Amino acid sequence: ENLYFQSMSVGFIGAGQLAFALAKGFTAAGVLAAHKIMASSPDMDLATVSALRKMGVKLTPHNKETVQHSDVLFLAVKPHIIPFILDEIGADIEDRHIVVSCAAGVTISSIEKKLSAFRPAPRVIRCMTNTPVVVREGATVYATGTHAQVEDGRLMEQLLSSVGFCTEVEEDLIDAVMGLSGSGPAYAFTALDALADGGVKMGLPRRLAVRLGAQALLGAAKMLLHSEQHPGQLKDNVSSPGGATIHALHVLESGGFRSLLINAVEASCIRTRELQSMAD
């Protein structure tokens, strides 16, 4: 790791929520010192830029400055901004750069087409991560581009593994991963807010209900990750005949609880596709 990271500099095009989250996770993991990170944004009036600055992250309005001072370049902007970014800094991408795109629905092919008009063989990697990298429990996948070298995938695997789970996938899976684990934390925060409301309805202080609900979800998720058993079998171990849990599971089933979560993953994926067809 020392060899990969000792003198590596990282740049963020964009200084929003994902840039802050990855920067916080990388520095908390100890892989990167905050001053070796640079972020650029046209609007300095954001709370994320303030948090990055108090972290010690170097800030600039000029994306070309971030490009000049970076080895690994994360594109942390909305999908529709990507092709305008590539036109802007494309003349500055050099052999040394690894361009890591975080946007969903922006293909490696389209990024490589843009950058290859300036210099052949751009090294491009697509990444799909989520905000819990900020506590080093992210869920990350990546796909390597046509010109990515052998050490490039291995470097990205080690970098993103320091802030959570990380595995290589074929590029065609990435938009579906966005619908599941990219959007997933928002599903979990909605559920935790509602579970806490349920606790409050039944008499619990709100502070206690939030803590218990979150701890229950965290523990159940860890249980599944550590067990070889199917989620339904773990559910069965918790639901005793005639008991409180099986009564509660019935009212979840009666509202189509499962189908709402399937609807959510699908809706996220569908939206990513229609954004992509607006560009393409």
Ligand X SMILES: NC(=O)C1=CN([C@@H]2O[C@H](COP(=O)(O)OP(=O)(O)OC[C@H]3O[C@@H](n4cnc5c(N)ncnc54)[C@H](O)[C@@H]3O)[C@@H](O)[C@H]2O)C=CC1
String marking each residue 67-86 x if it binds a copy of itself according to CB under 8 A: -----------x--------
**171 in a labelled binding site:** yes
Size of the site for a copy of itself (CB under 8 A): 116
Positive/negative CA dihedral, 142, 158, 162, 7: negative
- Residue whose beta carbon is closest to ligand X: 16
CA 237 to CA 223: how far, in whole Å? Answer: 12
**233 in a labelled binding site:** no
CA 36 to CA 72: how far, in whole Å? Answer: 11
Q: Please pick, from the candidates 79, 132, 138, 199, the single residue that binds ligand X as defined by CB under 6 A.
A: 79
CA 140 to CA 152: how far, in whole Å? Answer: 16
Residue type, 71: D
CA 155 to CA 161: how far, in whole Å? Answer: 10
Residue type, 66: T
Interrupted backbone of the chain, residues before each interruption (C–N > 2.5 Å): none
H or E element that contains 55 = helix 47-55
**252 in a labelled binding site:** no
Check: CB of residue 84 under 8 Å from CB of residue 110.
Answer: no
Q: Is 108 in the site for ligand X (CB under 6 A)?
A: no
CA 187 to CA 139: how far, in whole Å? Answer: 14
CA 57 to CA 39: how far, in whole Å? Answer: 7
Q: Which residue has the tokens 């300036």?
A: 118
Interface residues for a copy of itself in 102-161 (CB under 8 A)?
104-105, 130-135, 137-139, 141
Q: Could you say which of a copy of itself, ligand X, none residue 266 binds, taking C-beta under 5 to 8 angstroms by partner kind? A: a copy of itself
Q: Could you say which of a copy of itself, ligand X, none residue 59 binds, taking C-beta under 5 to 8 angstroms by partner kind? A: none
Q: Is 42 in the site for a copy of itself (CB under 8 A)?
A: no
Interface residues for ligand X in 168-207 (CB under 6 A)?
182
Instruction: Name the strands in the sheet holding 98-101, side by side, starting at the edge strand that comes first in the sequence.
Output: 58-60, 37-40, 10-13, 72-75, 98-101, 123-128, 138-144, 164-168
Q: Could you say which of a copy of itself, ligand X, none residue 70 binds, taking C-beta under 5 to 8 angstroms by partner kind? A: none
Q: Is 133 in the site for ligand X (CB under 6 A)?
A: no
Size of the site for ligand X (CB under 6 A): 31
> Whole-number minimum distance, CB 25 to ligand X, in Å?
12
Interface residues for ligand X in 14-53 (CB under 6 A)?
14-19, 40-43, 46, 48
CA 216 to CA 195: how far, in whole Å? Answer: 10
Q: Could you say which of a copy of itself, ligand X, none residue 187 binds, taking C-beta under 5 to 8 angstroms by partner kind? A: a copy of itself
**15 in a labelled binding site:** yes
**17 in a labelled binding site:** yes
Check: CB of residue 127 under 8 Å from CB of residue 102.
Answer: yes
With respect to a copy of itself, which residue has the nearer C-beta, 117 or 279? Answer: 279
Q: Could you say which of ligand X, a copy of itself, none residue 121 binds, taking C-beta under 5 to 8 angstroms by partner kind? A: none
Interface residues for a copy of itself in 176-195 (CB under 8 A)?
176-195
> Whole-number minimum distance, CB 141 to ligand X, in Å?
11
List interacting residues with ligand X (CB under 6 A): 13-19, 40-43, 46, 48, 63, 76-79, 81, 84-85, 102-104, 129-131, 182, 238, 240, 243
